[PDB]
Inverse folding.
RNA sequence: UAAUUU
């Protein structure tokens, strides 16, 4: 049993080190809770361990490297078989550890590794982004710890004395910022079937209401809009969950959450989102507030379909337009751009669905009628 | 809280 395999850490140690506030000073130690399991999950781990290591000065003593050494010796002492390793790490790997683990995984196909990270270390630095991409390309599955992973870590590796895990304030908001940033820096691409299903602009027949949203940023330079390749990606709405957002968080609000997190300077920026549903009234109100907030940012909203929220959505779109947002229905060129840019297309060109242009024209006429009232 | 990497 795990509590017999690990010496559980102090609750104060866990809460202070795994707090997922993305920008957090003072934490000079990395913590790593790991389980080693067989191909079959659904058991106690073969073994479990807690490693720690000071961030500075010697990366050779970071817990990732302590794990590699311990796991080498451990595998010597147990009958060989394929292993599934899981880490909960308080900080994501530094460039040296990311490269060492990537080398280890690439040279050993019998081992697969999943890394849940509480916070992203130096996510804004190109070297760290590149090293995490190298780790991903070696096979490591990298994810941000959410409530379930924090709770699992609490249950397995913390001396909670039977008390349940108590989430700190803003755990879900921090989670969404970090997950979007991880998607950006790993350059996650949308699944092609997911894109085609959600961005088809014929009248919607599915019972699902979900919103997918692709985003990019441009900077004004010498009177020309130039690309800002850093902040490009996609996201979706957060369905309601009492451990996350109890009333949900719509895709447009998650998008708005991202913009201050980018820490844009005073230059002129044009932020564009391609959203499968036009925003509901609440989303449009919040976007209008943001526009009134950040004059150095111009919003361009392209929508695949018009979402009738059974309420004030027309007034919402009119308010958004009145406040300076560019709102347009997506036409062929916008769909093709999103296919080429955000989708895991694997060389395949954009294949438009039936009636794309006709549905675009109908929806464009509807949008024009809404905005002219 | 943009957070000491030899
Ligand atoms: Zn390291
Ligand atoms: Zn909405």
């Amino acid at each position: 049993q795990i509590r017999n395999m690990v010496e559980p850490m102090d609750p104060r140690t866990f809460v202070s080190n795994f707090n997922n506030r993305p920008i957090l000073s003072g934490l000079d130690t990395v913590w790593l809770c790991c389980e080693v399991k067989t191909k079959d999950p659904s058991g106690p781990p073969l073994d479990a361990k807690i490693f720690q290591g000071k961030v500075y000065p010697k990366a050779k003593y970071h817990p990732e490297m302590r794990f590699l050494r311990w796991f080498h010796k451990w595998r010597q002492l147990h009958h060989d078989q394929e292993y599934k390793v899981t880490w909960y790490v308080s900080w994501s790997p530094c460039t040296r550890c990311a490269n060492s683990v990537a080398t280890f995984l690439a040279k050993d196909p019998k081992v697969t590794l999943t890394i849940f990270v509480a916070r992203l270390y130096y996510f804004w630095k190109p070297d760290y982004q590149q090293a995490l991409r190298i780790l991903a390309e070696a096979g490591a599955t990298m994810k941000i710890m959410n409530y379930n992973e924090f709770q699992d870590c609490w249950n397995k590796f913390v001396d909670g004395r039977g008390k349940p895990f108590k989430p700190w304030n803003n755990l879900p908001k921090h989670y969404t910022l970090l997950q979007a940033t991880l998607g950006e820096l790993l350059r996650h691409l949308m699944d092609p079937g997911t894109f085609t299903s959600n961005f088809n602009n014929k009248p919607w027949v599915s019972g699902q209401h979900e919103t997918y949203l692709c985003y990019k940023v441009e900077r004004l330079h010498n009177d020309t809009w130039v690309p800002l390749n850093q902040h490009r990606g996609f996201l979706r709405n957060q369905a309601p969950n009492i451990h996350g957002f109890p009333k949900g968080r719509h895709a447009a609000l998650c998008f708005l959450d991202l913009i201050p997190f980018w820490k844009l300077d005073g230059q002129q920026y044009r932020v564009t989102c391609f959203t499968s549903w036009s925003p509901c009234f609440s989303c449009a109100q919040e976007m209008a507030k943001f526009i009134s907030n950040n004059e150095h940012v111009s919003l361009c909203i392209f929508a695949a379909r018009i979402y009738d929220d059974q309420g004030r959505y027309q007034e919402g779109l009119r308010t958004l337009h009145r406040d300076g947002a560019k709102i347009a229905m997506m036409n062929y060129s916008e769909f093709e751009y999103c296919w080429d840019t955000f989708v895991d297309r694997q060389g395949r060109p954009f294949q438009p669905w039936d009636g794309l242009d006709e549905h675009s024209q109908a929806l464009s006429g509807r949008l024009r009628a809404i905005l002219q009232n």
Residues 21-28, 55-59, 94-96, 121-125, 263 of chain A lie near RNA strand B (CB under 10 Å from a C1'). The longest helix of chain A spans residues 171-186. Residues A 59, 62, 64, 93-94, 96-97 surround zinc ion (ligand 1) (CB under 6 Å).
